[PDB]
Amino acid sequence: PLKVAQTRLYQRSHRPNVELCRDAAQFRLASEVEELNLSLAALKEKLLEA
Amino acid sequence: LTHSLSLPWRPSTYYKAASNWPTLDPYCTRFTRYTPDD
Amino acid sequence: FLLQEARQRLNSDHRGKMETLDIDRGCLSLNLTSPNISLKINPTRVPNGSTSL
Amino acid sequence: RKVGERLQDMHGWKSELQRQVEELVSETELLLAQKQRLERALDATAGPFSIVTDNLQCRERRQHPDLVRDCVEIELLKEAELIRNIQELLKRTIKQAVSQIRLNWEHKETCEMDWSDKVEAYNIDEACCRYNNQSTDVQFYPHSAKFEESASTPETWAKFTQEHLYRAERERLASVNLRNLIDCILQDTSEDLRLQCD
Amino acid sequence: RPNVELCRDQAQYGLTDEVHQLEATIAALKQKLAQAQDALDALYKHLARLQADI
Amino acid sequence: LKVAQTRLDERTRRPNIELCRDMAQLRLVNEVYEVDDTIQTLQQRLRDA
């Protein structure tokens, strides 16, 4: 899921120069990465506690 | 949806865009770092 | 009267060829950078008048 | 789901942008022939002018008692003035026709550009929707602020196309109005020249 | 091009061919990319394995 | 109009929160549109003259 969101955000950065827009997709695609990352951080610290 | 505001604001593109096509509406409101290759 | 008509049926050609030239030399130009490049709608599509060689 | 909405919408805008520009091809084609009907009237009005000039040149060739100012000399001069006034009216309408065709193609190429950009994006957003966790392809593209750097808000995005479509149909209605003007100007100048010749 | 001048010319039959060719080439590179990002995924999975074992 | 356009184009590079809808922004847009009005009324008199 982290892999996908970076590839989704990268391709959308190659959208044409006026067609490059701040659609809600971009909004979620960003928030998505944040959650996925902070969730792996919570999972990474629990591996340290385990 | 909601056009919120992040503390690092990067409005660069809009400028170049309206530069090639004047006809354009405001890009106003209503990952804090760059890749080294960028 | 006939010779006058030949002139107005031979000029049509001249005008036609002179225009064709423009939409043929301009084409040779259009080189990548060309600021008007674009993926046209139905590009490969024989129009109506399409004659032959 | 959200990317999908964008496609559906983008496709709604793309399919509709495809109808505008193909229709502008058809109307320019109707104006393409109406400019040619405009000229071939100028093609066929030089013959009557050479008839009137020959008739005036041979009617000065009369003997002494019959070299007279009569009704034929009046209507032959009026026909010569009417032919010349037709040709200048027909030359001006041709120069209006070519300007309408140029503005049809300029307004057309602009609309097509937006469609080119849209096509590129469609393909990109289409692929982005077929990214499965159990799919390869995806990679760890290092985070970058350019992933969020945008150049239009969804609203402004539409506006761009909306505007393009508005002015594009303005060229449409205009040519229609001019093709009515071309049709009326041919029926008048042909009939005035026939009534003068009779 | 106007009236008759709109003629199927050596260019039309040629350009129309180039289009088909370019679209096939574009397809080849797209499929090739997919056969390479696939390899990178394998490379990564095997690295993870080798590293966990180390 | 030459000053009024360059004045705004330099102020479009204010970092982050500094890029503000202060009344200087709306007045210079008003300044740009007024010179366009003035240069359109003055070319009207030249065509009349």
* Distance of alpha carbon D139 from alpha carbon D142, whole angstroms: 9
The verdict on a CB contact (< 8 Å) between C36 and D109 is yes
* Distances in whole angstroms, Cα of residue A11 to Cα of each of D62, E22, F31: 89, 21, 41
The three-point CA angle D81-D86-D87 to 5° equals 100
Q: Which residue has the tokens 């060829």?
A: C17
CB D31 within 8 A of CB D94: no
Instruction: DSSP letter for F13, please.
Output: T
Q: Hey, what amino acid is at D104? A: N
D1 at interface of B, judged by CB pairs closer than 8 A: no
Residue A13 and residue D149: Cβ atoms within 8 Å?
Answer: yes
| Per-residue DSSP letter, B23 | -
Count of CA atoms in the C-beta half-sphere (13 A) of E8: 11
Per the CB < 8 A criterion, the answer to whether D111 and D80 are in contact is no
d(CA E39, CA E46): 11
**The Cα angle at residue F41 between residues F35 and F46, in degrees rounded to 5:** 120
Cα–Cα distance measured from residue D81 to residue D69, given in angstroms and rounded to the nearest whole number: 18
- Number of neighbours of residue D74 by Cβ within 10 angstroms: 10
Nominal resolution (angstroms)? 3.5
**Mind spelling out the 3-state secondary structure of chain A?**
CHHHHHHHHHHHHCCCCCCCCCCHHHHHHHHHHHHHHHHHHHHHHHHHHC
Alpha-helical segments (H) within chain C: 2-29
Here the tokens at position D173 are 């209605």
The experimental technique behind this entry is cryo-EM
What is the per-residue DSSP string for chain E? --TTT-B--HHHHHHHHHHHHHHHHHHHHHHHHHHHHHHHHHHHHHHHHHHHH-
Q: Which chain C residues are within 8 Å of D47, Cβ to Cβ?
A: 1, 4-5
Neighbours of D194 (CB within 10 A): 10
Cβ–Cβ below 8 Å for B10 and D151: no
Give residue for tokens 């225009």: C19
Beta partners for residue C51, in sequence order: E7
Q: Is A43 on the interface with D (CB under 8 A)?
A: no
